[PDB]
Design a protein around this ligand. Structure first.
Ligand code: HEM
Ligand code: CA
Ligand code: CA
Length: 330
């Protein structure tokens, strides 16, 4: 098909996405950058989609977190999501796609702006949300590993799929875990979709980057990096540790598994055969920058080996003394 301005797409319903793409790239993502709004938009894909259970209910990736914002943004597990919901709302109102479609589209577009990123398949045609998600369907960083894995399992994901989705934490920061240090990333490269998250979570902890005693947090290996309790434990648990380690220095696996599992997440509560493929709209991401490494000052002895089948790979360390990670600009 050929759209209004001459750009082409396989299925013509998808032409509606071109003006939306242009608009969000300029006016939501600050000129196609991999920064705070991209990261928050990716977080939103999960907080919308995971509100799905075959028995507890919820419509999954249905836009409910926007349409029923006054209910959902008040769930404890959704703390801080109100900012990005408020930012996306006027875009949904202005454009001609459902809220569910918009959230997944914006996430996919955003990930495609990040160096090292991947093109996530994107489907059009989710109907409007019917009801708010039930509460207590979004995992929390202080939930037991088995609780997180069961919740994700209930939604349809294997333990290895949870690991692949958590590649998202390679382009990610926290504002509410430790409110004294908002914008503190989960890896040293929050502007690059890379394996540093999987590496740096495997290191022995050293310090709290801000205050002690925050729920859902444990010690981090680096000033200016924060470590979730859940991420600490998933890197070490027998169900997930070998898969976690397998991501290290394997950019093509990170990309391919993230794209496939994000597609599956984007379709929770939906039927792919009742939607239209608009994957060819997503831009081509920039190339990976940087290579897999231990942080400056670290060595292999600082890695906590938790995969029983295979030792952690030796990686070279950046040169020089231990440095600290800059926060993500708000
Ligand atoms: C498996 C269980 C998960 C837990 C317990 C978890 C927990 C968290 C927490 C506590 C934060 C910080 C929020 C704040 O204080 O500002 C966060 C951020 C984030 N999460 Fe996860 N998460 C999980 C899975 C995922 C998944 C599957 C995705 C996929 C999209 C995702 C994407 C993100 C992103 C991109 C951010 C960064 C937001 C920003 O930088 O503005 N998370 N996550
Ligand atoms: Ca939802
Ligand atoms: Ca990264």
């Amino acid at each position: 098909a050929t759209c209004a301005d001459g750009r082409t797409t396989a299925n013509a319903a998808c032409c509606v996405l071109f003006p939306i793409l242009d608009d969000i790239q300029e006016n939501l993502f600050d000129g196609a950058q991999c920064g705070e709004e991209v990261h928050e938009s990716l977080r939103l894909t999960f907080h919308d989609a995971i509100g799905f259970s075959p028995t507890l209910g919820g419509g999954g990736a249905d836009g409910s977190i926007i349409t029923f914002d006054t209910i959902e943004t008040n769930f404890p597990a959704n703390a801080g999501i109100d900012e990005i919901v408020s930012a996306q709302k006027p875009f949904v109102a202005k454009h001609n796609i459902s809220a569910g479609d918009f959230i997944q589209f914006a996430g996919a577009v955003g990930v495609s702006n990040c160096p090292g990123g991947v093109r996530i398949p994107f489907f059009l045609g989710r109907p409007d949300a019917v009801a708010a998600s039930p509460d207590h369907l979004v995992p929390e960083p202080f939930d037991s590993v088995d609780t997180i894995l069961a919740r994700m399992g209930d939604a349809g994901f294997s333990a290895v799929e949870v690991v692949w989705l958590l590649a998202s934490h390679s382009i990610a920061a926290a504002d509410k875990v430790d409110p004294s240090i908002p914008g503190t990333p989960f890896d040293s490269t929050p502007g690059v979709f890379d394996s540093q998250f999987f590496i740096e979570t495997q290191l022995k902890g050293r310090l709290f980057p801000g205050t002690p005693d925050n729920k859902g947090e444990v010690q981090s290996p680096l000033q200016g990096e924060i470590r979730l309790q859940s991420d600490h434990l998933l890197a070490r648990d027998p169900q997930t540790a070998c898969e976690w380690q397998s991501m290290v220095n394997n950019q093509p696996k990170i990309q391919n598994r993230f794209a496939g599992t994000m597609s599956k997440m984007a379709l929770l509560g939906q039927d792919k055969s009742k939607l239209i493929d608009c994957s060819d709209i997503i831009p081509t991401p920039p190339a990976l920058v940087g290579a897999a490494h231990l942080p400056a000052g670290f060595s292999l002895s600082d890695v906590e080996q938790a995969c029983a089948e295979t030792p952690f790979p030796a990686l070279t360390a950046d040169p020089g003394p231990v440095t600290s990670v800059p926060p993500v600009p708000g």
